[PDB]
Amino acid sequence: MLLEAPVYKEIFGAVTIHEVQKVIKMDTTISNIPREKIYDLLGKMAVIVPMKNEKLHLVDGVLKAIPHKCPIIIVSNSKREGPNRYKLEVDLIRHFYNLTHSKIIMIHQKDPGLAKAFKEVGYTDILDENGMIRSGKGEGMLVGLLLAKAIGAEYVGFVDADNYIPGAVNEYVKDYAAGFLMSESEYTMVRLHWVSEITNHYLNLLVSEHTAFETTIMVTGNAGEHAMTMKLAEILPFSTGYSIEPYEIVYILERFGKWENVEEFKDVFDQGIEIFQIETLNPHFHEDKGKEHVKEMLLLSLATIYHSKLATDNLRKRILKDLEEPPKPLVMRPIKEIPIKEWMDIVEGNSETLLRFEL
Amino acid sequence: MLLEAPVYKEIFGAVTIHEVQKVIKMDTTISNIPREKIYDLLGKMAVIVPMKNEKLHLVDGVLKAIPHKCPIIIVSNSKREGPNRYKLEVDLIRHFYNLTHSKIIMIHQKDPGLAKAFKEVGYTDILDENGMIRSGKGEGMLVGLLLAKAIGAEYVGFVDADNYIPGAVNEYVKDYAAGFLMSESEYTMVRLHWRVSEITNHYLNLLVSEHTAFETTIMVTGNAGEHAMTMKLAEILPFSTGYSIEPYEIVYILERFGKWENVEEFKDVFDQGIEIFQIETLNPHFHEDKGKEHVKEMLLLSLATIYHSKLATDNLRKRILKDLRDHGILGENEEPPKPLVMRPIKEIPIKEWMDIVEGNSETLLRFEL
Ligand SMILES: Nc1nc2c(ncn2[C@@H]2O[C@H](COP(=O)(O)OP(=O)(O)O)[C@@H](O)[C@H]2O)c(=O)[nH]1
Ligand SMILES: Nc1nc2c(ncn2[C@@H]2O[C@H](COP(=O)(O)OP(=O)(O)O)[C@@H](O)[C@H]2O)c(=O)[nH]1
Ligand SMILES: [Co+2]
Ligand SMILES: [Co+2]
């Protein structure tokens, strides 16, 4: 693959944010990431697909588009009764596997075997009040991340299951790889770029207020399509809903944007954190969920920044003016401390929905 | 790549039509066509991109998605003055080249250097009243075909320049390769599938059933703008003018090879057979909306090609008139026009033609090709 070379970037403490780079040529002042080395990295990357009540036909297209090389991790939070959509998804995955021999793990977010595993290792931020896994995208992602960690993945890439364009999914995974192949830190994040303009406006404002120089470096504030090395992923606290993506940025800037407590994450401060932003060649066509979603998305997004400890009054004032105070985003602790072998054994010993195919 | 295996098909004389097959898995009762094999074949296939006044960003996306290995042939019939859109396209292509070094050839359909070469070799089917190359997509493809032959391509694949999905284009090229890798004959065609299409197919299938007595639905790629052929097949096909080209390829193949007749003339074609693959892409087809008239015209030309076929019957012709008139695009007592058909280019001595083009074309630009 050919891409614009990573030239311009902005540094905030230990955080390097690379300017957005366009994919120049798909199949191969320009960076040349040979097809050969991309495929080589693919085998070390788990593609996590969090889904919830999506049309099977879209799900089918997405799964078929993921490079065979990549282990697929599906976390469903689909409706369980009247009708059991989880069952329909299971039938779909079984058929898909019978025709492709894809390496796949799937599990339902509400499996009581999952709740049991988290309680026993003493990680309870993911549990709701009835002691079951809380409903939500961030929760499903966390579950997916632990499963990816349990199979030894070095990189994890997330892709939404409601994409109308299978080929874009195929490109996303390759672009994540390209991004990882262009970085020099083991702590790397790759975010894809095609309200989000509102979100980016404020994220940049979050840093501007301190530097005194207006910036537009961040253009992936709401990027659902992103990937990270497992080393970075395991140390990040995670929020949920529409706050996940922007919270990753806010948290990284908050914690590593200055040299405070370097002692606690000495290796991260040493290597630094790299954030690549890649503009895909394919446009973005997904399901239209109605606007009580769009409104939600912006409320949660700006709330994440509004509550950041980096937010000055000016910033807070403006966010309010632009939008009662915004609810504080629910944040869950990093999963690093979790003894993975132990967690995994409890999961596979008590989960009634966990399905594995060559993995 | 994984596709459903080519299990079912229907044979008409020396013509084999494979039942449509779906792509099952992108990168790798199921046929496994490994990536490495597809990549080896791409070097031998030229991708022809006929374009006329399309948006530059769309054109850009299409060229960036064609596998680097494939030589690219562009034939533009874009506006020449007020403003010179061909120049905007040349700037675009020059920039694309400096960033990727893709092998490319581009020329403008109306280049007087082209008309000179056709005229000089005695091929006038393509020239209009004043001896200039006729406007029309079929005519642009014919030009692209000779260029592809001139540079030694074994296969040719067509791709429309107004695709909103670069990825779909990347898939099309690989699907063509898949089809050729699954074929056995040197005379092979690969057509991609994803109301006009449905209507055209309804009648092409009818064209056949009027003779077999059994209703079929085997043909599902009647209006397949995205298709490929081995050069060996491409060079023996007459090509219809303007937008009537794709359905006519099916019609002519049925009329001429649908029965064992006058075999000596196409000796080897009858020996090897003609194979047509139909592959349903994983990607959706999303291209530019050109409006109602355009859609009516595609309809009119598609059915006209079938209405005038030698295989057509009275029942079929009447069913077509009712449909066209009833659909309001054919006057109440008017029949479909008979699209002009240009002859096969096999007899054109390509060296001779290519020399004339090279020595007289003002729009011809080559990049490592
Ligand atoms: N596992 C899991 N997945 C979810 C949940 N909610 C949404 N998803 C999926 O995560 C992705 C979210 O994208 P979408 O809901 O379309 O949000 P948008 O595209 O930002 O408006 C889709 O694949 C959803 O099906 C959830 O509660 N649990
Ligand atoms: N070279 C050439 N290309 C053409 C001509 N007319 C159309 N094209 C191109 O061939 C493809 C035709 O697509 P379109 O006209 O949109 O037909 P559709 O896909 O059936 O709606 C596009 O790339 C057009 O830009 C022509 O006269 N000459
Ligand atoms: Co969505
Ligand atoms: Co079109």
Can you give B86-110 as a three-state secondary structure string? Answer: HHHHHHHHHHHHHHHCCCEEEEECC
Nearest CA in chain A to B27: A67
B3 contacts: CB under 8 Å, gap ≥ 6 = B21, B22, B23, B24, B30, B31, B33, B178, B182, B279
The reply to whether omega before A83 is within 30° of 0 (cis) is yes
Q: Using CA atoms, how far apart are residues A140 and A134, in angstroms rounded to an integer? A: 9
Q: Using CA atoms, how far apart are residues A123 and A128, in angstroms rounded to an integer? A: 12
CB-based contact, B266 to chain A, within 8 Å: no
Cβ neighbours of B216 (radius 10 Å): 14
Ligand nearest to the CA of A48: 1
A194 contacts: CB under 8 Å, gap ≥ 6 = A279, A280, A283, A284
Q: Which residues of A touch B67 (CB under 8 A)?
A: 26-27
Place of tokens 């540079």: B151
CB-based contact, B25 to chain A, within 8 Å: yes
- For this PDB entry, the determination method is X-ray
- Which H/E stretch holds residue B12? strand B9-12
The values of phi and psi at residue B59, to 5°, are -60, -45
Q: Using CA atoms, how far apart are residues B369 and B102, in angstroms rounded to an integer? A: 9
For B202, the 3-state DSSP assignment is helix
For B313, the 3-state DSSP assignment is coil
The reply to whether omega before B83 is within 30° of 0 (cis) is yes
The values of phi and psi at residue A32, to 5°, are -110, 110
- State both tokens at B198: 């449905």
Q: Are strands A72-76 and A45-51 parallel, antiparallel or unpaired?
A: parallel
The values of phi and psi at residue B220, to 5°, are -125, 10
**The dihedral sign for the CA sequence A12, A15, A16, A18:** negative
- State both tokens at A176: 């994540």
Ligand 1 atom having least distance to the Cα of A135: 27
For B194, the 3-state DSSP assignment is coil
Q: Do B68 and A28 touch (CB under 8 A)?
A: yes
Residue A117 vs residues A70, A123, A359, B149, B206: alpha-carbon distances, Å = 26, 9, 20, 65, 62
* Amino acid occupying residue B110: K
CATH code for the part of the protein at B2-369? 3.90.550.10
User: What is the B228 CA–ligand 4 centroid distance (Å)?
Assistant: 17
Task: Give how far A39 is from chain B: nearest CA, Å.
Answer: 10
- State both tokens at A317: 């004032």
Q: Which residues of A touch B167 (CB under 8 A)?
A: 165-168, 170-171, 281-282
- Asked whether A341 and A107 are in contact (CB, 8 A), the reply is no
Q: Which of A60, A232, A43 is nearest to A151 (CA)?
A: A43
Which residues precede chain breaks (C–N over 2.5 Å) in chain B?
Answer: 28, 194
The values of phi and psi at residue B275, to 5°, are -110, 130
Provide the b/e sequence for A270-294 (b: ≥16 CB within 10 Å). Answer: ebbbbbbbbbbbbebbeeeeeeeee
The values of phi and psi at residue A268, to 5°, are -70, -45
CB-based contact, B24 to chain A, within 8 Å: yes
**The dihedral sign for the CA sequence B345, B351, B355, B361:** positive
Residue A161 vs residues A65, A172, B154, B282: alpha-carbon distances, Å = 11, 13, 39, 15
Q: What angle do CA A285, A290, A293 make, to 5 degrees?
A: 95
Q: Using CA atoms, how far apart are residues A248 and A331, in angstroms rounded to an integer? A: 11
- Asked whether B168 and B287 are in contact (CB, 8 A), the reply is no
Using CB distances shorter than 6 Å, the residues near ligand 1 are A 50-52, 54, 75-77, 109, 135-137, 140, 160-162, 224, 286-287, 289, 293
Four-point Cα dihedral B344, B348, B349, B352, nearest 10: -140
CB-based contact, A83 to chain B, within 8 Å: no
Q: Which of B66, B2, B70, B72 is nearest to B42 (CA)?
A: B70
Residue A28 vs residues A35, A291, B67, B101, B351: alpha-carbon distances, Å = 6, 41, 7, 11, 32
- State both tokens at A187: 């702590």
Q: Do A25 and B61 touch (CB under 8 A)?
A: no
Give the best residue of A282, A286, A357, A358 to mutate against chain B (max B CB count within 10 A).
Answer: A282
Nearest CA in chain B to A28: B68
Q: Using CA atoms, how far apart are residues A350 and A111, in angstroms rounded to an integer? A: 9
Q: Which of A284, A224, A280 is nearest to A21 (CA)?
A: A280
Q: Using CA atoms, how far apart are residues B239 and B245, in angstroms rounded to an integer? A: 6
Q: Using CA atoms, how far apart are residues A259 and A272, in angstroms rounded to an integer? A: 11
- State both tokens at B227: 């298709």
Q: Are strands A273-279 and A21-25 parallel, antiparallel or unpaired?
A: parallel
Q: Which of A129, A125, A132, A161 is nearest to A240 (CA)?
A: A125
Q: Are strands A21-25 and A30-32 parallel, antiparallel or unpaired?
A: unpaired
- Asked whether B262 and B215 are in contact (CB, 8 A), the reply is no
**The dihedral sign for the CA sequence A298, A299, A303, A304:** negative
DSSP symbols for B259-308? S--S-GGGHHHHHH-EEEEEEE-SS---B----HHHHHHHHHHHHHHHHT
Place of tokens 């581009």: B106
- Asked whether A277 and A220 are in contact (CB, 8 A), the reply is yes
Can you give chain A as a three-state secondary structure string?
CEEECCCCEEEECCEEEECCEEEEECCCCEEECCHHHHHHHHCCEEEEEEECCCCHHHHHHHHHHCCCCCCEEEEECCCCCCCCHHHHHHHHHHHHHHHHCCCEEEEECCCHHHHHHHHHCCCCCCECCCCCECCCHHHHHHHHHHHHHHCCCCEEEECCCCECCHHHHHHHHHHHHHHHHHCCCCCEEEEEECCHHHHHHHHHHHHHHHHCCCCCCCCCCCCCCEEEEHHHHCCCCECCCCCHHHHHHHHHHHHHCCCCCHHHHHHHHHHCEEEEEEECCCCCCECCCCHHHHHHHHHHHHHHHHCCCCCCHHHHHHHHHHCCCCCCCCCECCCCCCCHHHHHHHHHHHCCCCEEECC
Give the best residue of A3, A97, A102, A281 to mutate against chain B (max B CB count within 10 A).
Answer: A281
Q: Are strands B188-193 and B227-230 parallel, antiparallel or unpaired?
A: antiparallel
- Asked whether A113 and A351 are in contact (CB, 8 A), the reply is yes
Q: What angle do CA B274, B277, B278 make, to 5 degrees?
A: 145
- Which H/E stretch holds residue B49? strand B45-51
Domain locations in chain A as residue ranges:
2-359
Place of tokens 């469903």: A76
- State both tokens at A180: 């990882």
Ligand nearest to the CA of B147: 2
CATH code for the part of the protein at A2-359? 3.90.550.10
**Is the beta carbon of B236 within 6 A of some atom in ligand 2?**
no
- State both tokens at A207: 């840093």
Q: Using CA atoms, how far apart are residues A50 and B67, in angstroms rounded to an integer? A: 31
Ligand 2 atom having least distance to the Cα of B161: 23
- State both tokens at A73: 């991790």
Ligand 1 atom having least distance to the Cα of A140: 1
Q: Reduced to 3 DSSP states, what percent helix, strand and coil does chain B have, rounded to the nearest 5?
A: 45, 20, 40
Q: What single-letter DSSP state applies at residue B163?
A: B
Nearest CA to ligand 1 atom 5: A137
- Asked whether B341 and B248 are in contact (CB, 8 A), the reply is yes
Ligand 2 atom having least distance to the Cα of B54: 25
Provide the b/e sequence for B302-336 (b: ≥16 CB within 10 Å). Answer: bbbbbbbbebbeeebbebbbebbeeeebbeeeeeb
**The dihedral sign for the CA sequence B290, B296, B299, B304:** negative
Q: Using CA atoms, how far apart are residues B209 and B201, in angstroms rounded to an integer? A: 12
Structure resolution, Å: 2.0
* Amino acid occupying residue A206: L
Task: Give how far A64 is from chain B: nearest CA, Å.
Answer: 5
Place of tokens 């044979």: B11
A213 contacts: CB under 8 Å, gap ≥ 6 = none
Q: How far is CA A142 from the centre of its chain?
A: 9
- Asked whether A119 and A106 are in contact (CB, 8 A), the reply is no
- Asked whether A191 and A277 are in contact (CB, 8 A), the reply is yes
Q: Using CA atoms, how far apart are residues A158 and B368, in angstroms rounded to an integer? A: 39
Q: Using CA atoms, how far apart are residues A298 and A237, in angstroms rounded to an integer? A: 21
Q: Using CA atoms, how far apart are residues A157 and A173, in angstroms rounded to an integer? A: 7
For B282, the closest of A64, A99, A100 (CB atoms) is A64
Task: Give how far A65 is from chain B: nearest CA, Å.
Answer: 5
Name the B residues in 273-292 with CB < 8 Å from any A CB: 282-284
Cβ neighbours of A9 (radius 10 Å): 14
- State both tokens at B150: 């001139």
